[PDB]
Amino acid sequence: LLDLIWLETILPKTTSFIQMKMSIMVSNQKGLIKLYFLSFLITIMISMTLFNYHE
Amino acid sequence: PTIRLQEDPDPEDENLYEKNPDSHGYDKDPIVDLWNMRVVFFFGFSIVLVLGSTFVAYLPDYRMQEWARREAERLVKYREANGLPLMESNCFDPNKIQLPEDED
Amino acid sequence: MTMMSGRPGRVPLQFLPNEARSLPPPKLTDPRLVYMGFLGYCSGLIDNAIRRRPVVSAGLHRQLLYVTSFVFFGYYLLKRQDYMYALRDHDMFAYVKSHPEDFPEKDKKTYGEILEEFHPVR
Amino acid sequence: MNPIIYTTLIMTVMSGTMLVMISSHWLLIWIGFEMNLLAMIPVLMKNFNPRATEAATKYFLTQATASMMLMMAIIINLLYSGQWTITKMFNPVAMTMMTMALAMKLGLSPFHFWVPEVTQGISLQAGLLLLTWQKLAPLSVLCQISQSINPNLMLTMAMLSILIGGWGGLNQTQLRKIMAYSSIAHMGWMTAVLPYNTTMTILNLLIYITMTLAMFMLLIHSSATTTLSLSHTWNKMPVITSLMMVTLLSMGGLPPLSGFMPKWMIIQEMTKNESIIMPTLMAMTALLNLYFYMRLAYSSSLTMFPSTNNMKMKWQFEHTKQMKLLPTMIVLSTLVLPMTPALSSLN
Amino acid sequence: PFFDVQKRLGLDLDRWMTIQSAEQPHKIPGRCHAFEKEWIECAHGIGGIRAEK
Amino acid sequence: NVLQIVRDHWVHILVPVGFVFGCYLDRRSDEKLTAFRNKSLLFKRELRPNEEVTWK
Amino acid sequence: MLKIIIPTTMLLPMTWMSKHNMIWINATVHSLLISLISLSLLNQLGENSLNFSLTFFSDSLSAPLLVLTTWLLPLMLMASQSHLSKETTTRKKLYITMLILLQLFLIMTFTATELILFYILFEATLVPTLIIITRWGNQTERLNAGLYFLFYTLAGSLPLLVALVYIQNTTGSLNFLIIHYWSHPLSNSWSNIFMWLACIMAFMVKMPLYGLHLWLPKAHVEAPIAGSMVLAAVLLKLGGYGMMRITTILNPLTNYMAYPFLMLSMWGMIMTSSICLRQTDLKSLIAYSSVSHMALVIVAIMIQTPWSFMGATALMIAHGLTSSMLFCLANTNYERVHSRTMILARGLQTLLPLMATWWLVASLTNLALPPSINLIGELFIITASFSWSNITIILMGMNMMITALYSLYMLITTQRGKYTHHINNIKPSFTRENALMALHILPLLLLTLNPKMILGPLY
Amino acid sequence: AKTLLHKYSDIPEGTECHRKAYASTSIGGATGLIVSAYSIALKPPASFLEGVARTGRYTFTSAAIGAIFGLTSCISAQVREKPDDPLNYFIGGCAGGLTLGARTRSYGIGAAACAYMGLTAALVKMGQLEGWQVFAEPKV
Amino acid sequence: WIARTFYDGPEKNYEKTMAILQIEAEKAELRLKELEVRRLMRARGDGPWYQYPTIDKALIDHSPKTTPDN
Numbered sequence A: 001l002l003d004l005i006w007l008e009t010i011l012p013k014t015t016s017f018i019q020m021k022m023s024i025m026v027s028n029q030k031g032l033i034k035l036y037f038l039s040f041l042i043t044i045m046i047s048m049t050l051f052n053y054h055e
Numbered sequence B: 001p002t003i004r005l006q007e008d009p010d011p012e013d014e015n016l017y018e019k020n021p022d023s024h025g026y027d028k029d030p031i032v033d034l035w036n037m038r039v040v041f042f043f044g045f046s047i048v049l050v051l052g053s054t055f056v057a058y059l060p061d062y063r064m065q066e067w068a069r070r071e072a073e074r075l076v077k078y079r080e081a082n083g084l085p086l087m088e089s090n091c092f093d094p095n096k097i098q099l100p101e102d103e104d
Numbered sequence C: 001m002t003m004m005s006g007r008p009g010r011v012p013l014q015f016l017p018n019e020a021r022s023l024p025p026p027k028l029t030d031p032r033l034v035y036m037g038f039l040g041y042c043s044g045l046i047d048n049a050i051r052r053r054p055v056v057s058a059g060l061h062r063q064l065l066y067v068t069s070f071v072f073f074g075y076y077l078l079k080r081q082d083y084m085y086a087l088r089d090h091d092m093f094a095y096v097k098s099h100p101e102d103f104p105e106k107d108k109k110t111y112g113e114i115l116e117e118f119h120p121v122r
Numbered sequence D: 001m002n003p004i005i006y007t008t009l010i011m012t013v014m015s016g017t018m019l020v021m022i023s024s025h026w027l028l029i030w031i032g033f034e035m036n037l038l039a040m041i042p043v044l045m046k047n048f049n050p051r052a053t054e055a056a057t058k059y060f061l062t063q064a065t066a067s068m069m070l071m072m073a074i075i076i077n078l079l080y081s082g083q084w085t086i087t088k089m090f091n092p093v094a095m096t097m098m099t100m101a102l103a104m105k106l107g108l109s110p111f112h113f114w115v116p117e118v119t120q121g122i123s124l125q126a127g128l129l130l131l132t133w134q135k136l137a138p139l140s141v142l143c144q145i146s147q148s149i150n151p152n153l154m155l156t157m158a159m160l161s162i163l164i165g166g167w168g169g170l171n172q173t174q175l176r177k178i179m180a181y182s183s184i185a186h187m188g189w190m191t192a193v194l195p196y197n198t199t200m201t202i203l204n205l206l207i208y209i210t211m212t213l214a215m216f217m218l219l220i221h222s223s224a225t226t227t228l229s230l231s232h233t234w235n236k237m238p239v240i241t242s243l244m245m246v247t248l249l250s251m252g253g254l255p256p257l258s259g260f261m262p263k264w265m266i267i268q269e270m271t272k273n274e275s276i277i278m279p280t281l282m283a284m285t286a287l288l289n290l291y292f293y294m295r296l297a298y299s300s301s302l303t304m305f306p307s308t309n310n311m312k313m314k315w316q317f318e319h320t321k322q323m324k325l326l327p328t329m330i331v332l333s334t335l336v337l338p339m340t341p342a343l344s345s346l347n
Numbered sequence E: 001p002f003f004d005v006q007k008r009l010g011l012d013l014d015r016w017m018t019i020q021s022a023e024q025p026h027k028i029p030g031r032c033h034a035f036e037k038e039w040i041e042c043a044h045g046i047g048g049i050r051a052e053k
Numbered sequence F: 001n002v003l004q005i006v007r008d009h010w011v012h013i014l015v016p017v018g019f020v021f022g023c024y025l026d027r028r029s030d031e032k033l034t035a036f037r038n039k040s041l042l043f044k045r046e047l048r049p050n051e052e053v054t055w056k
Numbered sequence G: 001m002l003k004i005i006i007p008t009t010m011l012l013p014m015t016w017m018s019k020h021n022m023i024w025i026n027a028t029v030h031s032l033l034i035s036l037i038s039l040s041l042l043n044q045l046g047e048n049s050l051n052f053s054l055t056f057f058s059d060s061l062s063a064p065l066l067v068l069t070t071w072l073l074p075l076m077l078m079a080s081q082s083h084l085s086k087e088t089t090t091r092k093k094l095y096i097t098m099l100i101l102l103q104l105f106l107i108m109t110f111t112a113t114e115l116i117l118f119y120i121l122f123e124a125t126l127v128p129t130l131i132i133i134t135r136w137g138n139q140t141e142r143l144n145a146g147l148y149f150l151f152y153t154l155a156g157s158l159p160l161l162v163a164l165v166y167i168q169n170t171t172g173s174l175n176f177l178i179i180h181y182w183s184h185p186l187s188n189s190w191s192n193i194f195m196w197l198a199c200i201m202a203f204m205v206k207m208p209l210y211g212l213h214l215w216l217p218k219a220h221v222e223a224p225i226a227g228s229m230v231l232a233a234v235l236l237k238l239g240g241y242g243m244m245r246i247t248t249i250l251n252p253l254t255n256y257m258a259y260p261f262l263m264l265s266m267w268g269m270i271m272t273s274s275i276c277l278r279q280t281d282l283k284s285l286i287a288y289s290s291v292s293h294m295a296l297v298i299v300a301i302m303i304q305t306p307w308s309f310m311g312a313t314a315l316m317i318a319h320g321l322t323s324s325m326l327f328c329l330a331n332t333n334y335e336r337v338h339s340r341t342m343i344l345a346r347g348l349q350t351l352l353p354l355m356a357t358w359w360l361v362a363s364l365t366n367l368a369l370p371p372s373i374n375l376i377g378e379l380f381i382i383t384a385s386f387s388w389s390n391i392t393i394i395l396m397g398m399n400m401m402i403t404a405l406y407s408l409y410m411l412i413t414t415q416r417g418k419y420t421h422h423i424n425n426i427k428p429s430f431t432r433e434n435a436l437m438a439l440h441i442l443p444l445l446l447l448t449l450n451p452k453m454i455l456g457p458l459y
Numbered sequence H: 001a002k003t004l005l006h007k008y009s010d011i012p013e014g015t016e017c018h019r020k021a022y023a024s025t026s027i028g029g030a031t032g033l034i035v036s037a038y039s040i041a042l043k044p045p046a047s048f049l050e051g052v053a054r055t056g057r058y059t060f061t062s063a064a065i066g067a068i069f070g071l072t073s074c075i076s077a078q079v080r081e082k083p084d085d086p087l088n089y090f091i092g093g094c095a096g097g098l099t100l101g102a103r104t105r106s107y108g109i110g111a112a113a114c115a116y117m118g119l120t121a122a123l124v125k126m127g128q129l130e131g132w133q134v135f136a137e138p139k140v
Numbered sequence I: 001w002i003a004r005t006f007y008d009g010p011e012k013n014y015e016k017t018m019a020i021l022q023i024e025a026e027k028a029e030l031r032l033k034e035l036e037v038r039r040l041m042r043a044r045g046d047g048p049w050y051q052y053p054t055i056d057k058a059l060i061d062h063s064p065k066t067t068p069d070n
């Protein structure tokens, strides 16, 4: 109950699960320039508003 | 072929006593085996073990145990002869200490 | 931020200003120089291993050139590093000298007059 | 391609970089960037195929947009202060636009999507050039305008770069995408310390360049672009795989290898200011880069994968072309840590 | 980063066009020649941090 | 005939040579920490008529 | 102390330049010689440590650890040459090189004067161990074990590094002497609490602490025999040594930050002793024994008393020797039957009587039979804990019972009963194995004869 | 913008819980809007109404998390009469994690989110108390 | 005999520890002083370090500019 299941579940298994999920999220992209150029525009606007307006 | 890969079969473990009835378990070469045994026994038991234990047993008293015992003997002698208490609760002279002037 | 790029009097691409000649050169037995020679020897061994040549005995002249080149670069590297550290120390000492208000020497107190709290271990 | 034309194009690429590096005029810096991009585009398409053409198109679009933004920032800064010299950039809006343009040029997150794609689409030599020499000019410009950099934006982009590089590289079986992701993480590490100390930036850049050159040269030596094709090298040249594993451990940041030296030093610099949380987060994240390097080491060096019959033929032939600087790059990648204080020579 | 080849060699590749008050053709002055001259003379040799204030 | 024996067992001298070299380097390192020789409040002493240094 | 360091770096080319059939003999002879040379470090003072130079120093706590490391290297060489017979010459030289590098790293680690250099060497010890485990281990689990060995360490040790440099930005130095002489109390703030955690968690993981121990059974089961010996005997003691060194700057915060770690240590001592009773793997039993003993050492270091420190040092040394011997004893049976199941080979006393005697002595030493140094350490820690709180004697008492049970259980399961009928490949014990067990056991009783050499600086 | 952060942080801890909840829900709405914008840019929804639905779902989830966090944090602070206490922020973070778990209809998500969000909010409170600097200004 | 052959007196270790302690304490004090110096120099900008470039004054053309008022 403790060593083989829950101590494994809390620290290393949850860490592995989270890292794998975030890797799957980040690395899966179709490779289309349209999508991430729109993302570039969103980032530029966010940067000019959030960071640049406050100086 | 109903197989998955070309591989050597798992070999059977070799017995060191088959080719050498007195094999010592060090090497398959009898001469190298015997000399490995001899050097292991000589430098493990004869040299490091016994001589190291003798060296450790007769290490000079750098920890100052007998010195501390003799100093305690002198100090107890003096304090009993002069009637002084054997040990003081203060390890430092209060004259060399300046407490805060005000405790309120 | 850069800390010594615009120091007054700095020649752009000198790599060894004249003032650096006022410092003692590193000895030829400097352990850093010996480590640089060891790096050259390891480079020679790795070159022999990559080329599928006898690692230790294939090319003596190439190994010698490797070691010599590494030592030759390391000597000047050590000289420049020592000069830079000397410059840093020199500037720091000059600055503390010229601004005594920011580095005042307060009175010394002996442990017989300082109250330190005692925390028992029990 | 003609060897003469190729050498002329390489010379023009380096000339654009050097012009950006030695100019005191913003227009000349922009011209250097233009020359570098113009000459670099054909290099990516040396081996003609649809993938190379797509990579070149994406690279050109990204760099052209970056140059647009760069010139707009220069013009705004000229408008609000009639200056052409590269200095503190008296306008904050121009400074923000300049930071975003240079981040797009470098590949810093979130302007990171083009790097793995372009790296996968071009050959190993073009990838080596792109991931080593193309970082020099934007980093030099950022070092020259370091004082006016808003810490929040650059530090946010560096955090994003480290996180995204680790997470993306966790998922790759292709070696070129692994290398692109590693590059993205290393540039994040470089730009994190940039507002505080540019000497640490230069030191990290030099160490990264040496490690990347060694790794790419080893990958060229054993003609492998995927994990499985690299898994066959132990049966052909075991020494190459052993040196590969040690170099991978160095890039992973494990002491006492040289790869530990920059991050360590960077961390120290970050703690000379207050800045405690950020180096902790950066180390925790670099654990992911270490993980996928270590997985590669498992696949190629510490275990023996099955081989093929035809590899027997390859046992009878030798490597004709040889890289002269490979042993020096390997040694500088692995055994350099005891020479850490020599970094004082960089400033 | 910045290798000052111009300063080292005395070449003046692009320093002639950096500021407005630097040797115009036919001595045609800029609209703010005097102000730029005054600012440059004030800020010379004291560094960016000092000159900023 | 000792050529073959030497080429076979010359590796047996590396560790003793390393040991004596380490002892020599330890002595050299000790030679650089003599800033307080015969200067401590507990072991200050008047030099003998013949000796030069209290310790090496 | 370069007189010990340089001979190992000379072992390197001597091994790499030796003949194909003389690597083991040369390595064993010269490692024994280096151990004999290192034996001279036990001559320690009563007031301060041996300050050899600006970079290396030797205390009464680290000297037995160096002696144990130098003594363990030849034992690893003797245990490895059996299963490495079929390997090629270059790979055997690489294995010996990895062991030599591990010994050199440990030797510098235990004597570094600064905390940063100690950290660098303490982290450099990872690479040879990982290479050995992941390359020369037997089953497919080794790879996973390697990962569990690596990141578990780094996730605990990377924050410590940050803490370390932060300290140098505040105090101005990380030398242990200056740190000890210029110590100041730690206030009660969240910043100081997190600095305490950053300084402690790395060594807590290395012990390992209960709940952070999941890497140990994997690493100690899947690694080769020399890997298991070096992991149990010395590598677990790095955490204890580091915690002892670092607790000088953490007072008086520890006075209340030791609570959860103390409770985890005691309850996990009980839990792992209970786990050892139901184990089908013989190596996992020894691994969980190691966890229990290290939990005892953690309790001793946390309560911070001279008696607890003395007991911790004695128990560290004794457990290193005992666990190495038990691992070798299990490995002999594994080499005979090629399986780690405990109930497979039974009644071995009928076929191997001297090996039965070795098993009996190792098991008796494991359950702390008086007057062995195992019992000295355990009893000192027990008395210190009783002074800390009278109720502790309950939990410790339970452990003192359960331990004995499983110890004898192991013995009775393997040596007594009737032999397995179908196992007929059990050859008489070689001289190499008997010499290995004898060289493991004789130093234990010899140190029993003179117990002040392993009681630490607080003696 | 930082105007929302200053609106949230200007109000004292255990006073005017409704205003603090409004500021928290506004911050949550802004964060959810940015998340939905990036998700739409990188993962197109194939329909305008589908994109509107995704934006509404993300923004509502973020706003609900923020509102619950602020409301319970302020309520606990005023009930216990113990301002500057990281336990209040831990309670708020766990409540927000439970809100997220209910929104996604998962027990494990709820538990993990409670633990991690409570820990992060407690850490933010400690940083505010001791003045920890996430983006340190250049000093040396 | 063991003491005569293999070891020295305690005064050697005593004074070597004294020298090591002195060197280390001086190094620590120098490190702290350097940190404070860097802080002050960057805050004020009045020292040799952190000297960022400014436009050169010798570039100005001091000639009649076709108009009396420049």
Ligand SMILES: CCCCCCCCCCCCCCCCCC(=O)OC[C@H](COP(=O)([O-])OCC(O)COP(=O)([O-])OC[C@@H](COC(=O)CCCCCCCCCCCCCCCCC)OC(=O)CCCCCCCCCCCCCCCCC)OC(=O)CCCCCCCCCCCCCCCCC
Pocket: C042, C045, C046, C049, C053, C054, C055, C056, D238, D239, D242, D243, D245, D246, D256, D301, D302, D334, D335, F014, F017, G009, G013, G016, G017, G090, G091, G094, G097, G101, G127, G128, G131, G135
């Ligand atoms: C900190 C303290 C100081 C330490 C310094 C750091 C470490 C030492 C320096 C490292 C660099 C030195 C060697 C580099 C080049 C060697 C390349 C090589 O492959 O070696 C083969 C070569 C044998 O080849 P050969 O003789 O031609 O015949 C066999 C065939 O080649 C048949 O060859 P093959 O190709 O068929 O064999 C295949 C084999 C071939 O693959 C290999 O051999 C692996 C070699 C990798 C080289 C190391 C990488 C680069 C260096 C960085 C080291 C990092 C150290 C930090 C700690 C982390 C450890 C990884 O691959 C495998 O079997 C797969 C095994 C997978 C295991 C993975 C682990 C490998 C990494 C471990 C490296 C540890 C350090 C290096 C150890 C020494 C290695 C020779 O080895 C040698 O003989 C050379 C070593 C000794 C030469 C120097 C001796 C000096 C002269 C003696 C007198 C001394 C004077 C003293 C003064 C006093 C006066 C008396």
Ligand SMILES: CCCCCCCCCCCCCCCCCC(=O)OC[C@H](COP(=O)([O-])OCC(O)COP(=O)([O-])OC[C@@H](COC(=O)CCCCCCCCCCCCCCCCC)OC(=O)CCCCCCCCCCCCCCCCC)OC(=O)CCCCCCCCCCCCCCCCC
Pocket: A002, A006, A007, A010, G210, G211, H094, H105, H106, H107, H108, H109, H111, H114, H115
């Ligand atoms: C280092 C040494 C070793 C230590 C490490 C090892 C030990 C520690 C770690 C391991 C234990 C922690 C894991 C907790 C469970 C994780 C949940 C999970 O896995 O989700 C995936 C998994 C998959 O879910 P799914 O796929 O989304 O849906 C399918 C379900 O199977 C379909 O579900 P269903 O339809 O069958 O019914 C589910 C439903 C109904 O459940 C049932 O069907 C049957 C009723 C069972 C519920 C039990 C609660 C009532 C009885 C409790 C009485 C007092 C508790 C003990 C305290 C004594 C006080 C003196 O449950 C609920 O409605 C939950 C409502 C919330 C009320 C209960 C929560 C109370 C939390 C405890 C507060 C303690 C405060 C501190 C006290 C300090 C002083 C001692 O979830 C479950 O299946 C389990 C559902 C129930 C989970 C809640 C149970 C509470 C466990 C104790 C929590 C305390 C530990 C955490 C402390 C830190 C938190 C800040």
Ligand SMILES: CCCCCCCCCCCCCCCCC[C@@H](O)O[C@H](CO[C@H](O)CCCCCCCCCCCCCCC)COP(=O)(O)OCC[N+](C)(C)C
Pocket: B048, B049, B052, B053, B054, B056, B057, B058, G039, G064, G065, G067, G068, G071, G317, G443, G446, G447, G449, G450, G454
């Ligand atoms: C197989 C058959 C077995 C049965 C037959 C056996 C025959 C009899 C043999 C057994 C002898 C019985 C022992 C009785 C005790 C006598 C020995 C004792 O007197 O010596 C002690 C001394 O013992 C030694 O000090 C202990 C040995 C040292 C242990 C080190 C082991 C060697 C190094 C190996 C590597 C280390 C690995 C572990 C790392 C920590 C005394 O200590 P001490 O009070 O002072 O001496 C006072 C007088 N002095 C100071 C002038 C000398």
Ligand SMILES: CCCCCCCCCCCCCCCCC[C@@H](O)O[C@H](CO[C@H](O)CCCCCCCCCCCCCCC)COP(=O)(O)OCC[N+](C)(C)C
Pocket: G188, G189, G190, G193, G210, G211, G212, G257, G260, G261, H085, H086, H087, H090, H119, H122
């Ligand atoms: C598998 C095992 C892994 C290893 C486990 C390691 C153990 C680490 C635990 C850390 C020990 C204690 C941490 C902080 C010390 C006190 C904790 C708290 O309970 O004490 C009270 C703290 O009060 C409340 O608890 C407020 C803190 C609430 C936020 C903490 C989160 C608690 C939830 C449990 C999360 C589990 C953590 C581990 C995650 C893996 C005291 O109140 P207060 O006097 O005001 O604070 C004292 C500090 N002052 C003086 C500066 C003011």
Ligand SMILES: CCCCCCCC/C=C\CCCCCCCC(=O)O[C@H](COC(=O)CCCCCCC/C=C/CCCCCCCC)COP(=O)(O)OCCN
Pocket: D274, D276, D277, D280, G151, G152, G153, G155, G156, G157, G159, G162, G163, G166, G190, G191, G192, G194, G195, G197, G198, G201, G205, G212, H130, H131, H132, H133
């Ligand atoms: C395999 C599992 C092992 C787990 C290992 C992880 C445990 C690490 C515990 C926390 C380590 C981070 C601490 C960072 C180093 C502290 C150095 C320090 O003292 O800095 C403090 C600053 O303290 C901090 O900033 C700490 C913030 C923590 C950020 C990262 C949080 C990591 C997660 C915390 C919860 C987990 C902690 C316990 C985990 C136990 C293991 C399960 C003082 O700085 P100043 O700003 O100058 O203070 C005075 C001026 N106001």
